[PDB]
């Protein structure tokens, strides 16, 4: 829904990958540092960006390093992403199917993403992370067997629906 999406995208707006200017800036930083302090790429801090990309995320799931996984209600070759609910349920990592790979695109400075994943998280927002994990698990992972039993689709068109319902009304009732 829109509430949990708003909270989730505040969380991911806190964690974006490095853009071009940031990378060139830290290039100048480490070009100064290795030439002067000779720190083996450790004068720069450890990154906390969002992990993404589909083979990347599937590898992080299979090695259980993910904290949270987000998935689109999209990509038209759907066989790309129908196994990620089963992987996240098999490996215990929580997961939520968010609307639109467009928003997942804009949080990662790309056009389409179709996945997003947190593996690290700083100590400031562990509680908000856990609250989102709780809400998502209330929604998606715990209903997984029941949704696995439901058969979607089958809703008739509205002209057929109205004809069906009038025929069903006049045959059993008046």
């Amino acid at each position: 829904d829109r509430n949990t999406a708003a909270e989730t995208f505040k969380l991911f707006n806190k964690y974006r990958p490095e853009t071009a200017a940031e990378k060139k800036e830290r290039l100048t930083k480490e070009a100064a540092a290795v030439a002067e302090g000779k720190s083996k790429q450790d004068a720069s801090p450890k990154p906390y960006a969002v992990k993404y990309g589909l083979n990347h995320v599937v590898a992080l799931i299979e090695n259980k390093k993910a904290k949270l996984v987000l998935i689109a209600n999209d990509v038209d070759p759907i066989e790309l992403v129908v196994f990620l609910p089963a992987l996240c349920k098999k490996m215990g990592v929580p997961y939520a199917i968010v609307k639109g790979k467009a928003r997942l695109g804009t949080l990662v400075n790309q056009k389409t993403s179709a996945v997003a994943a947190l593996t690290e998280v700083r100590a400031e927002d562990e509680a908000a992370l856990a609250k989102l994990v709780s809400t998502i698990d209330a929604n998606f992972a715990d209903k997984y067997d029941e949704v696995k039993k439901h058969w979607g689709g089958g809703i008739l068109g509205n002209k057929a629906q109205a004809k069906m319902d009038k025929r069903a009304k006049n045959s059993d009732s008046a």
Partner: protein
């Protein structure tokens, strides 16, 4: 890694999910043209092990071929010859339909070069394939040595000389004792053993 999952899912065809997807896509593909452009490979795994690298120049086309035997011409059935050769309905056209798809998109995108192809779908009337063409004059492929062999002009129309994936099957080219009529090529191995070789000092 997640092409192994697509690989194994695509191996499970008549399961309920893939026959749902197969039905929606045979509908969608039947509503478009006979040969049209695929914006993105519908099977990234199967395109990817045939040589697709998703960068500027690789193009997928998606192509309908009419499906069945080859009703011979020679009108009103008369072959004018021995009753050995008097058949019309049951003759079967030695090139596969996958080869016909590759050859037709080779003619329509004549600047491009066919690389391989793969099946996508079938009803009774049609088979639908996707061809994995390469644009050889593009500067991203004239460089990058793993794929610049397509730029050499001996590979103009690999599809029409049986040089693609399904061509070398349909020419029967493999090693073995089961391919002695066509192992180096059918007609070269014909002609080298109908040729009377004569020397100067006749043995």
């Amino acid at each position: 890694g997640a092409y192994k999952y697509l690989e194994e899912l695509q191996r499970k065809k008549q399961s309920d999910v893939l026959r749902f997807l197969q039905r929606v896509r045979v509908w969608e593909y039947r509503q478009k043209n006979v040969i049209h452009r695929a914006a993105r490979p519908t099977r990234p795994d199967k395109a990817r092990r045939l040589g697709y690298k998703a960068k500027q120049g690789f193009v997928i086309y998606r192509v309908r071929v009419r499906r069945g035997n080859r009703k011979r011409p020679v009108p009103k059935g008369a072959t004018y010859g021995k009753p050995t050769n008097q058949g019309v309905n049951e003759l079967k056209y030695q090139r596969s339909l996958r080869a016909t798809a590759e050859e037709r998109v080779g003619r329509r995108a004549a600047n491009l070069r066919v690389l391989n192809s793969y099946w996508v779908n079938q009803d009774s009337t049609y088979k639908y394939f996707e061809v994995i063409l390469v644009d050889p004059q593009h500067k991203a492929i004239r460089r990058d040595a793993r794929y610049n062999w397509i730029c050499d002009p001996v590979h103009k129309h690999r599809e029409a000389r049986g040089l693609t994936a399904t061509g070398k099957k349909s020419r029967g080219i493999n090693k073995g004792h089961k391919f002695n009529n066509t192992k180096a090529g059918r007609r070269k191995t014909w002609k080298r053993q109908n040729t009377l070789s004569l020397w100067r000092y006749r043995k």
